[PDB]
Each structure stands twice: as structure tokens, then as C-alpha cells.
Design a protein around this ligand. Structure first.
Ligand code: ATP
Ligand code: ATP
Lengths: 359, 271, 247, 131, 122, 72, 120, 72, 73
């Protein structure tokens, strides 16, 4: 697993070392947010992260470089960049230079990562370079090669064989949408090339849910291979309960009128969703992620409230990080959610909720 | 902007579709609850009317002259139009108002000079805005229909009738004979026979088609009401009840009970 | 696609095998045809596909037939652009397709494999005078039972439960039996999930679903038909689970 | 031996288990019930109830009923039954003062039948809520 | 608009205002066909508070006095966050939903509210 | 839209038509919403009535010019 | 359609007919999604009047009689106006809506209503 | 639609198919909103047994035509 | 007349001898069945039918040719 630092990503739509997974969604919705959350989370690991800032503002690039530097994660991150004021030539080139750097570091038997931002600007640059050369225009003026252009650079991020040192480049590109359209030419092309998709809907971004990941569309095709043994179980419990939450979403204000079972269903789903919210550039490690998802999906917040549960869960995470350091031992040495680990977590939960109900 | 507004109109007609399914399911849940609430008042009125019959046999000879069952000089007929406090239900409110205007048009040529009672918000607002009809009292749905709303309408018609102010008080409420056709039947309430069997507005004793205890079932993918005629019956009589407390006063004690139970079952069946 | 097609039609032409072709999927072929033609400087067709959409489809599809030598059968996936069957690529793919097998996420989430959807699978072969009147009426009655249960999922399985009807309980029970019986332990699910494989011939499927419908196997547990092959294996699984019931 | 009790209201049934001794008012006087009494009809009026079955006496605030006693069971059919403790005694004293005030604002047959009714209503709520 | 760039109470109040407006615009295509007597108290309270908020975000500009018919206004940031704390927290749900129309400060909204109600009571 | 606004009117009509178009936009937008309602307040319903009167006084017949004195 | 050409009465009746037709046209979405009971009485008065008008706007043709079977009817303007005035007054709103369907003069519609209450 | 349909349709088919057209058109109309308004009428029960059955006699097996005698 | 052998067509939407009747309908809705029923109904009448099939699958036209030969047509 390529651990992301977000509960939704690593829990539901799992990204592994080698799988391509783009972030589709409207403008100013959280694509650069989760794209930096991922890279800033990689400090606990050893990977070499690559950012390809294409066609940007040259000021957001300096801002996010200052972010990566003042957070310490520039100790490994290379950020190639070619802003909008550049010709179409260098914007078209830059992702290939990022891919060559990641290819080299991957061929040194070392796991890597690369972020493309965005492929839409790269495609616009290539389309301009084509139309200036009187190459025949195609659908929405994009020439007949943007598919080959994108597939060419996206097929280079591989988990190589164990005779070549199992190096891994995890291409995690970004393709913005206009008016919520993924059926345009460039979005359809990229979502057909890449393995999984992650839909960031700006409606959820205006609905408090940040990161605004839309689980009903976002899906990865790697599956359980990108989740550790301690993860996939609670991920299954969470997908079960969250599908049972979304299918009961219409029965909103009728929860008192509902059945008692469906009333617990709606309330527990709401606790799960309020757990899903987490601030920008706040990474969560695999101990923290499994602690959060466990305490959420097993009804240990159903006595609590939809407002308190964020403060309550961060305080429970602090309590179990400080008072019970053995959970980190068990998770990072055994990679499984054993019986003793589960009971240790429940006793941490019980004492924290007993101390917190007094507060 | 055409494709975006078209996608958004698609989304609107999807959200309305799914919330209409939602209101369908919560309405079927409350229907299934209401037919249980009928059974919650079934044994009371069952043994109650059985008492009203069996105790009446030795008091068939003597005359009690109960004021609830007296005959005032038949001049006026009051009318309780039992509308729900809700809208968007369908023809329920409008068919009630059709039978209501038909009754207060039918009672104008006989020389009756009727009055009205209103116990639904979507009906009592209509009777608020129409001053031509003599309204005595408006009822809304705030107090509990289980005891409190039933008792409010009960003691209100009791006050209108036991001091004998208005002449008659009759009831205009519908039943659960079907899903595709509700029929607002016009049954009189306050001029009652001492047996335990209601009379029509003209006294027909229309309880021959009683057919009570509606419970919802399905013959196919859709649900029909399946009115499912009378199941159980357990009266015998009292051999020598040798009872105290002045049998006139006993029947005047037994009448308001049965009246409140009739009004409670009326409100449950309307809802 | 033409590479795989000629490699298959050699097997048809000279070894008289019953060849099985897989083009996964036809939408990438249509898209690549459009992109070749767009780079060739041809004036594109309506939505943006190549001007030669139908003839390119035909010269790939009408080489996949049944001759007196043998018969090449193709099962080719389709992607439909934003589920729009009015688009030219699906509406021209279906001009040569015969049947469709729409796998469900619902029968995967329920957990019964294969995850197909019987109400959404269409076939031109399902006619009485093609595959028999018996097979036809069996399939029609099975469809009607599942179509009862799909609307009754909201009715009784959520709220109603009002002793629905014995003529409707008889449908709910056997619709449970049939949803369990639709699964089958695959040959190559053995090492995957632990299910030893069974072949179930066509006549055995028809007779098994015949007896699930006809009021002869309503008394056994509904799990006696889940992940089982023939119907005799289902009755034997009922006896073995009942031996575990007397245990 | 122990007779049965069914404090039955139109909407619900409040007490359905047994009892050995009940004391309840009537429309003219009062009545006491010992175990194994004759079938004796009872016109119980608006008023509290004294009940005794291996415990202390408790008030059951009833508001007008009828009891057709037969053998081993008394069917106390009241339109309004409730326990004396659940009704708040300060709410009872407020109802008492409100009713004593609003008795005098009634000056007619339509009005007085909602004057003594409300007065005995608050009084028989108080006669429970104190006890 | 960040916690570490524009202060904590401003960021919380801004994201909360965007929250309740997104709730209203989501509610709209339901309350269109359903009706207004078929929402719960939290939902109708949200509808009325959003309908106050949307009017309160309208200020008569200095250059727009030709187009509005009102002297020009200049609102501080302090006044705006005070107004949205006061509108959201509940202590102004007795004011008219035209009182927040083209007013500078929440004090001016209250004085306009008194003006409206006094004129209507005459 | 009028981009010049009340600097294209005389002082009389500038006085009486000060906040007219904006209050009529408000009345139209709240009459569109008062159809999504059952019961209202008398204050807002009188406001709906006065907005209807303002709406009815502006229907001008063809070949029927009003002067500025008539208008104000 | 100007009052200087066709006079005041004709243009007035035409204007009010178009007004009621557009009122029904505006309500058509709310009708199609839910129905008619949700409306006010003053709204269903216009919906009913326009449902009668939308049928009385048919007229059988002297040519298309060989298709439908209803023989051709020529109707005047001076009687079309009186028919539409009788519709908009409300002296005809009691009889049903399919009575007005495929007739000529207004007396054909009234005799149609009188006729379809004989065949029981 | 057939422009010249009733010309070429023979006299026998004309005389027998007029009433079929009338009843099938009215069945297509009565099937719409069949449940609420016109449920237990004599005419609508009869017309359901004559409008389902009309459609029952319209249906046919493929490759099994009926000459005009069997048609009439 | 030109009778197609269908009750509905030859009943309420007749076809003349000299009248174009477009068989418009979706994919797999039975239009080929209508055309073959019309052709097979002409087993006696001097209606020299011609069936031209633009751009269809070869198995469909082969099955229809088989039907046309076996049904004596
Ligand atoms: N999880 C979060 N919590 C709070 N705020 C967030 C979160 N994610 C993003 N934001 C805010 O959203 C705004 C836009 O974020 P971001 O730049 O990632 O969107 P974008 O799609 O990358 O924008 P653009 O389309 O301009 O590249 C930023 O101001 C950021 O502070
Ligand atoms: N009246 C009928 N009775 C029985 N089967 C029918 C009837 N009409 C059509 N079918 C069947 O429906 C299937 C499709 O019909 P048909 O081939 O006529 O339509 P089509 O438009 O030609 O389809 P395609 O164009 O895809 O070949 C055929 O297998 C045919 O046998």
C-alpha cells in the first residue's frame, strides 16, 4: 500500500505502489489539497515524490514549494514545474521529464511517486502545438494523439519484476473538469487510461465534507492488495455501513418516524461521515487510520454527538498514542489486527470515553 | 449553459422522484401503525357495545330517558367535517368538502338552519375564511388524537348537546374501504339508540355493512386493503347483575364512554 | 482485433473447433478507429467517430460466424459513453450483438457469483420456437418470480410483513430459492475462494429450475440451493445440512 | 381468589394485571370491592381510585367510567385514566386555581356544563396529585 | 480564507455560512414541489435563516446610489462577523426577512426592522 | 438593465421612483415563493397586495403614451 | 390581431382566451408531475376552462372526414366568438370536456352533451 | 397512419373494422388513469374485458399470416 | 388492397397497392417480422415481391432466405 494520510483514500478507494489513480473534479475542489496531503504523508516512508506543476500561476508553485519546505517533506521531493507563461512546448515536455526522473529512481530499486498537475494544461499545450502545425483537428479541437500522448506517459509507472528490484512509480495525475463533465474528450481519455478514479465533487466541498471525495463514483480496481491486513476488515465493515447509509439518505428528517433499526443506521452513518472530515495537510498514519475507522464503525461513537466526535476522536487518538504505545508496536511489526490489539484498542477507547464524559 | 441547466433539471426530477418514494414509504409505515391503533381501541369498544346490548335487555322494559339519547325537537343538525390536518393527500380533503357542501346545501331547503364543527387544519382554515357557515368551534391537530383530541371533540359535542343547545350533531368522516376510492359517509352521532348500533342521519341503522378491522395485505406486487370481515365475538349476558347506582344514571354513565370511543375510532379511521 | 480474429478463424477453418473469441473491449477499437481516421485528415461523422464507423464495425463483426466447417463465437465487452445508448458506438455495436449479460454490483454485494442480473440480461435466442416451449415457459416464469420479488423487496422486506399472502409467501420463498440457485461453484474459483467446480448442462438447469418452481422443493432450507451444481446435488446438500441439523 | 383488574381506556390499556382490593367512587356514592364479589354493575364517576394489593394505597385519577363486575374481574372502562403521581401537583394546584377562576365566567347551560366539568376536573386531578 | 491566515472565528463563521446556504440550495428543489408545511423545525429554521442571510449580504454601494436610492455604505469586517454571529446564533429570528435588505450594519438591520414593524402597525 | 439609472430622470420621478425596480424585484421573488406556502403573515400578504397594485399600474396600452406628470 | 381591425369585442375575447391558455400552459408541469388536487379552486377554474378550450380548438375538416369519419363543418367567425364567449362566461362549464371535442358551432357541443346522456 | 388506407381496405373489412377502431381507441384512453376514477363501473369492467381481449386477438405468431377471411 | 397478413395493419392502418408505408421502429422491435409476414402472405396474389436488405448481418439475411425457401415463397 501507498499510504496516503487520508481515511477515505486508504480505507475505501485504495491506492497501491504502482497503480495509477487520478483526481477528477471541478475547479478549486481539493485536488491540490489531497495531492499535497499524499506527498506530505510520505515522510514516514522513504519514497521519492515528484510533483509536475504544469501551467500554474508561478505563485501557487512558490506557495506549495514553501509548504513542502517548511513542512520538511522537501528533503526528498523533486518538483519540476513549467508555468503558464512558458510556451506550449515546455508545458508539453515537463511531465515527460518528471516521468524520466521517476523512471530512473524507480530503476534504482527504489519506490517512487509522481504527481501530474494537471494533464488538462498539458493537453491544451499539445493541442495548440498541433493546430499551429496544421495537424488536422479532431473532437473539440484536440488532435488525434492526446490519447496516445497521455497513454504513453501513463504506461511508464510500473511495479517492476522482482528480478528488476520491484521498483514502483505511482502516477497520481490530476484532470480537472468543467461543469462536472467527465464525458469530455480529455477526461474520458484519462479515466480510461488510469486504473482508478477519485471524484472530488465541489458540492461536498461546500457541504463541510473536506476532503470532498465522492465515494459513489470514486473507485479503484486494485482492491484489497493496497490495504494491509489490519485495514481491509474495517474497510469492509465501513463500506457495508456506508452503503447502508447512502441508500438510506432520502429518509432524512423522518428518522424519528423510521424504524429503530434504521434510526440507528442513519445516526451511525452520520457519525461515520463526520469522522470522515479531516483538515487540510493533516496526515494520518496507519495506526491512526485504523484507530479512527475502528472506533467509528463499531458503534463506539453512537453515544456521542455529531459535533463533539471530531474533538472526541482527536483526543482519543492523542490518548492512545501517549498512554498505549503498544498498539503502534503491534500494527507496525505484525501488520494484522489481532485479538489482543483489538482488546487493547477497546480498553483505550473505554477509559478515554470515561474520562471525557466527565471532562 | 444549456447542458448545465439541463443536467440540473435532470437532477431535480431525480431528487423529487426519490423523496416521493420516501414519503410513500413513511406514509405506508404510518398506515400500518394506524391499523394497529384501531386494534388498540378494538377490545374496549367491543366489550363496551356488548355491555350496551346485554345490560339493555332487562332495561328494555323500563324507560330511562337519557339526555344523550333524548329526542329534542328536530330543527338543527350540526356537522363535524373530519378533515386531516394535512395537504397533498389527494381527493380526501376535496371529497370531504364535496360531501360537506352537498350536506350544507341539502339542509338549506328543508328549513334546518344547520351548524358546523371543524377538526382539521386544512378544513378549519377553509371554515375560517368562509363566514357564511355558522362555526361553533375550530379544532386543530395539536392535542393527541389517542386521548386528547378525541376527548376535546367528545366533550365539545357533549357540551353542545347535553345542555341541548344545538338540536342534532352528526359526523362527516370517511373510512378505509379501499385505496382507490375513499367514501365520506355521513353518520349521525349524538342522536343515538341505546342499543350500541349507530343510526344514519335518517336513522337507517347502517351498521349492517360493518366489515370492521381493515388490515393491509397484498394479492400481488401492489397492496389492496382486503377489508376482511368480522373475526371474533364474545358476549353472553349478566344473569342477575342486581346492580346499584340508579339504572338511569348507569345508562347516562355508559353513553359518554361509547361516544368517546366512537369519536376516537372516527379520528383513527380518518387519519 | 483483426489479429485475434484471424488467429481464431484459422482454428475455425482448419481444425473445426468451436472457437471462443474475446474482444475486451469493442469501444477501444471504435475509439482507435476514430483516432486513426482523425489523424488521416478525414471529415468525421456525427458525434465525432470516424466517417467509416459502420463498415469498420461490420468488417470486424461479420467475420465471426458459423460455417459448415466450424463456428467462432465472440463475447465482447462494451463501454457506453456516460450510459448513453443513443451514441453511435453502442448503437452500432448492438446492430451486430445478439444477447447481453449485464453483471450486477448488486449480486456481488449480496455475495452470489456469477454476479449477472437476470432481469437485465436479454437474448434473441430466448423464444419458444428456438429453444423449446418448455425452456421458454420456465424462463418466463422464473423472470416473473424474480420480478415479483424485486418489487416485494420494498413491500415486505422493508416494512409491510402483514402475513403478506400465502400466494405471495410462496413467491418470496421460491424467489429466495432461485436467487440462491442461480449461483454455481466455478472450476477456477476453487483455488480462489474454495469452491470445487461443477458443470451443469442445459437440460439439468431447466429441470432443476422446473422443480424449484413446480412446488416440489419448497420444504428444504433456502441455503440447500446456494452454491450448488445440479438439483440432485441440491437435495443431497439438503440431507447433509439436515444431518448437521440433527447434530 | 385474587380478582383481575383491567383499567381500560379507549386508546390503551393501563393496568391489566391482578388486584386483591380496590376502592372506587361512583356517580351516587362509593363502593368497596373485596375478593370474590357478586356480579354487580358499577357506574363510577369522575374521581380518584384507591387500590390495595400487597402495597400501599395509590390514587388512580379517573374521569368518568363504568364497571360491569362479574366474577373474578372488574372492567373499569374510563375514557380518562391516569396515575396520581405522574400528574404534577403544582400543575394540579395551577389547574385548581384556573378552574376555580373560570367557573364564574360561565353564565349559561352551554357555559355551565363547561364550568362544573372543569371545576371537578381540576379537583379530581388535585385529589390524586396530592396523594 | 484559512485558519492560519484570516483568524479562527472568521474562518469558522465563513464556512458555517457557506454550509447553511448550501443546505438551503440543496433544500430548494424539494421545498418547491413538496411545500412549506412539510419540513421539520430544524429544516424550516434553516430555510428562514438562510433567507435572512442572503438578503443581509446586499449592501448599497457608493457608486450605486443612482441605481438603488439610498446613501452609500461602508461595512467593516468586525461589523460583518458580528452580524453573522448574531444572525446564525439565533437571537434575530424575530426580525423581518426584508429588514436585512440593503443595510450596512446589523444595528441598521435592527433599526430597519423597527421601522418596518412600526409602519405596519401604524 | 438600465446602466445609467436615475441620473436619466427628472427630480420628481427620481424622488418617487427611488427604490422602485429593486422593491418590485423583491416582490416578484417573494410572490414566487409565497406560492410554495399555505399560511402567511398579514404584513407580508399586504405587501404582496401592494406589490400586485404596483404591478397592475404599469400595464400601458399600445398607442397610449403617458406624460411625465401622469407618470409621477 | 389589433383592436382597430377586428374591433374591441373580438380582440378582447381573443386576448382572454390566450391568457387562460397560457395559464394552463404554465401550470402544465405542476399538473404533469403531481396532478390537479393540489391547486386552488381559482386555479382549477382556469385549468378547467382551458381544458375545455383546448378541445374546442379542434374542428372537423371537409377534407379529413375521410380519415376520422366526422364530416366537415364550416363555422363562422361571428359564431366562433360567441362560442368562446359562452365558454369563458361559464354557462357551459358544467357539461363535460369531451363534449367540446370535434364539433363545429357551439350548439353542436351542447347537443353533444345532451346526446351523450341518452345512450346510457 | 395511412393516407389511402380506407380506400384500399375492402368493404367487408371496413364494415367489420370501424367498431374495432372505436373500441381499441377508447381502450387506449381508458387504460390511462384506469385505477382511481373509473374502477368499478359497468362500462369500464366490460371495456377492460373488451380492451384486454381486443389486444389479445391482435397478437400473432411470427410467420403465420391470416388471409382476409380469417381476418374478418 | 395489399394485405400484410397482420390483423392490426390490415385492419386499422391498411396498405394500398401503390402506397408507401414506412415501418418505423426501434432496434429489435419486429420490423423484419412485419416485412416477412407481408411477403409470405402473397403466396397466391400476383405480387412479385422484391426484398432488398441494406447493410444487415449475413446470418439474418441467410435465415430469412431459408424462411423464404421453406415457406414456399
Ligand atoms: N480538507 C480541506 N479542509 C479545508 N480546506 C481545504 C481542504 N482542501 C482544500 N481546502 C481549501 O480549498 C481551496 C482550494 O484548494 P485546491 O487548490 O486544492 O483546489 P484546486 O482544485 O487544486 O484549485 P485549482 O483548480 O485552482 O488548482 C484552498 O484554499 C484550500 O485551503
Ligand atoms: N410477432 C412475433 N412473434 C414472435 N416473435 C417475434 C415477432 N416479431 C418479432 N419477433 C422476434 O423478435 C426478434 C427481432 O425481430 P426482428 O428481427 O423482426 O426485428 P429487427 O428490427 O429486424 O431486429 P434486427 O434489426 O436487430 O435484426 C426476432 O427473433 C423475431 O423472431
Amino acid at each position: 500500500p501507498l499510504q496516503t494520510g487520508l481515511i477515505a483514500i486508504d480505507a475505501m478507494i485504495p491506492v497501491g505502489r504502482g497503480q495509477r489513480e487520478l483526481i477528477i473534479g471541478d475547479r478549486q475542489t481539493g485536488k491540490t489539497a489531497v495531492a499535497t496531503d499524499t506527498i506530505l504523508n510520505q515522510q514516514g516512508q522513504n519514497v521519492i515524490c515528484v510533483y509536475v506543476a504544469i501551467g500554474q500561476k508561478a505563485s501557487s508553485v512558490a506557495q506549495v514549494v514553501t509548504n513542502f519546505q517548511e513542512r520538511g517533506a522537501m528533503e526528498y521531493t523533486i518538483v519540476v514545474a513549467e508555468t503558464a507563461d512558458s510556451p506550449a512546448t515546455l508545458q508539453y515536455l515537463a511531465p515527460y521529464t518528471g516521468a524520466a526522473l521517476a523512471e530512473y529512481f524507480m530503476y534504482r530499486e527504489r519506490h517512487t511517486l509522481i504527481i501530474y498537475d494537471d494533464l488538462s494544461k498539458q493537453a491544451q499545450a499539445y493541442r495548440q502545438m498541433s493546430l499551429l502545425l496544421r495537424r488536422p483537428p479532431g473532437r473539440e479541437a484536440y488532435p488525434g494523439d492526446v490519447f496516445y500522448l497521455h497513454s504513453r506517459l501513463l504506461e511508464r509507472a510500473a511495479k517492476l519484476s522482482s528480478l528488476l528490484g520491484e521498483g514502483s512509480m505511482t502516477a497520481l495525475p490530476i484532470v480537472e473538469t468543467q461543469a462536472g463533465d467527465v464525458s469530455a474528450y480529455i477526461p474520458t481519455n484519462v479515466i480510461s487510461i488510469t486504473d482508478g478514479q477519485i471524484f472530488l465533487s465541489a458540492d461536498l466541498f461546500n457541504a463541510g465534507i473536506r476532503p470532498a471525495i465522492n465515494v459513489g463514483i470514486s473507485v479503484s480496481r486494485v482492491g484489497s492488495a493496497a490495504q494491509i491486513k489490519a485495514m481491509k476488515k474495517v474497510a469492509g465493515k465501513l463500506k457495508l455501513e456506508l452503503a447502508q447509509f447512502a441508500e438510506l439518505e432520502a429518509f432524512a428528517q423522518f428518522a424519528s418516524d423510521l424504524d429503530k433499526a434504521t434510526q440507528n443506521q442513519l445516526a451511525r452513518g452520520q457519525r461515520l461521515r463526520e469522522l470522515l472530515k479531516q483538515p487540510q495537510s493533516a496526515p494520518l498514519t496507519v495506526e491512526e487510520q485504523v484507530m479512527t475507522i475502528y472506533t467509528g464503525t463499531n458503534g463506539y461513537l453512537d453515544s456521542l454527538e455529531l459535533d463533539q466526535v471530531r474533538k472526541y476522536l482527536v483526543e482519543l487518538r492523542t490518548y492512545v498514542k501517549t498512554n498505549k504505545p503498544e498498539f503502534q508496536e503491534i500494527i507496525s511489526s505484525t501488520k494484522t489486527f489481532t485479538e489482543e490489539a483489538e482488546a487493547l484498542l477497546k480498553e483505550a477507547i473505554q477509559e478515554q470515553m470515561e474520562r471525557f464524559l466527565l471532562q | 449553459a444549456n447542458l448545465r441547466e439541463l443536467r440540473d433539471r435532470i437532477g431535480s426530477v431525480k431528487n423529487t422522484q426519490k423523496i416521493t418514494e420516501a414519503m410513500k414509504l413513511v406514509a405506508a409505515a404510518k398506515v400500518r401503525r394506524a391499523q394497529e391503533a384501531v386494534v388498540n381501541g378494538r377490545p374496549f369498544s367491543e366489550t363496551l357495545v356488548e355491555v350496551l346490548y346485554n345490560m339493555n335487555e332487562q332495561l328494555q322494559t323500563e324507560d330511562v330517558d337519557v339526555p344523550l339519547t333524548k329526542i329534542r325537537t328536530v330543527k338543527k343538525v350540526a356537522l363535524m367535517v373530519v378533515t386531516g390536518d394535512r395537504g397533498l393527500c389527494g381527493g380526501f380533503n376535496n371529497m370531504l368538502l364535496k360531501k360537506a357542501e352537498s350536506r350544507i346545501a341539502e339542509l338549506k331547503k328543508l328549513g334546518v338552519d344547520y351548524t358546523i364543527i371543524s377538526i382539521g387544519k386544512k378544513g378549519n382554515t377553509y371554515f375560517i375564511r368562509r363566514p357564511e357557515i355558522p362555526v361553533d368551534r375550530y379544532f386543530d391537530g395539536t392535542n393527541l388524537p389517542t386521548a386528547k383530541e378525541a376527548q376535546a371533540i367528545a366533550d365539545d359535542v357533549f357540551s353542545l348537546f347535553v345542555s341541548e343547545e344545538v338540536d342534532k350533531v352528526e359526523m362527516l368522516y370517511t373510512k378505509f374501504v379501499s385505496l382507490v376510492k375513499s367514501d365520506p359517509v355521513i353518520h349521525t352521532l349524538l342522536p343515538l339508540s341505546p342499543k350500541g348500533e349507530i343510526c344514519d342521519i335518517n336513522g337507517k341503522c347502517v351498521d349492517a355493512a360493518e366489515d370492521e378491522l381493515f388490515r393491509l395485505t397484498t394479492k400481488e406486487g401492489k397492496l389492496t386493503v382486503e377489508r376482511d370481515m368480522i373475526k371474533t365475538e364474545t358476549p353472553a349476558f349478566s344473569p342477575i347483575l342486581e346492580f346499584e347506582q340508579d339504572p338511569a344514571q348507569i345508562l347516562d354513565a355508559l353513553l359518554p364512554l361509547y361516544l368517546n370511543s366512537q369519536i376516537l375510532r372516527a379520528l383513527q379511521e380518518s387519519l | 482485433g483483426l489479429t485475434a480474429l484471424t488467429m481464431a478463424e484459422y482454428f475455425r477453418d482448419v481444425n473445426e473447433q468451436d472457437v471462443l473469441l474475446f474482444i475486451d473491449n469493442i469501444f477501444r477499437f471504435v475509439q482507435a478507429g476514430s483516432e486513426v481516421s482523425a489523424l488521416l485528415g478525414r471529415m468525421p461523422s456525427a458525434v465525432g467517430y470516424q466517417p467509416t464507423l459502420s463498415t469498420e464495425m461490420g468488417s470486424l463483426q461479420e467475420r465471426i460466424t458459423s460455417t459448415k466447417e466450424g463456428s467462432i463465437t465472440s463475447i465482447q465487452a462494451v463501454y457506453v459513453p456516460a450510459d448513453d445508448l443513443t451514441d453511435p458506438a453502442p448503437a452500432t455495436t448492438f446492430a451486430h450483438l445478439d444477447a447481453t449479460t449485464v453483471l450486477s454490483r448488486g449480486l456481488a454485494a449480496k455475495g452470489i457469483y456469477p454476479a449477472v442480473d437476470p432481469l437485465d440480461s436479454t437474448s434473441t435466442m430466448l423464444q419458444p420456437r428456438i429453444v423449446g416451449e418448455e425452456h421458454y415457459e420456465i424462463a418466463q416464469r422464473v423472470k416473473e418470480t424474480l420480478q415479483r420479488y424485486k418489487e416485494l423487496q420494498d413491500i415486505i422486506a422493508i416494512l409491510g410483513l402483514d402475513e403478506l399472502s400465502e400466494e405471495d409467501r410462496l413467491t418470496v420463498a421460491r424467489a429466495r430459492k432461485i436467487e440462491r440457485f442461480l449461483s454455481q461453484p466455478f472450476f477456477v474459483a476453487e483455488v480462489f475462494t474454495g469452491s470445487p467446480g461443477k458443470y451443469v448442462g442445459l437440460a439439468e438447469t431447466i429441470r432443476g429450475f422446473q422443480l424449484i418452481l413446480s412446488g416440489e422443493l419448497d420444504s428444504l432450507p433456502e441455503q440447500a440451493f446456494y452454491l450448488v451444481g445440479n438439483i440432485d446435488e441440491a437435495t443431497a446438500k439438503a440431507m447433509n445440512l439436515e444431518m448437521e441439523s440433527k447434530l | 381468589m385474587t380478582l383481575n383488574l383491567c383499567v381500560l381506556t379507549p386508546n390503551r390499556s393501563i393496568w391489566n394485571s391482578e388486584v386483591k382490593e380496590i376502592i372506587l367512587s361512583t356517580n351516587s356514592g362509593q363502593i368497596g370491592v373485596l375478593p370474590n364479589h357478586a356480579p354487580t354493575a358499577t357506574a363510577v364517576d369522575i374521581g380518584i381510585l384507591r387500590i390495595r394489593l400487597n402495597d400501599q394505597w395509590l390514587t388512580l385519577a379517573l374521569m368518568g367510567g363504568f364497571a360491569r363486575i362479574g366474577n373474578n374481574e372488574i372492567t373499569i372502562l374510563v375514557n380518562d385514566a391516569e396515575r396520581g403521581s405522574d400528574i404534577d401537583p403544582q400543575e394540579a394546584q395551577q389547574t385548581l386555581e384556573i378552574a376555580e377562576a373560570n367557573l364564574r365566567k360561565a353564565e349559561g347551560k352551554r357555559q355551565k356544563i363547561e364550568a362544573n366539568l372543569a371545576l371537578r376536573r381540576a379537583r379530581t386531578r388535585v385529589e390524586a396529585s396530592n396523594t
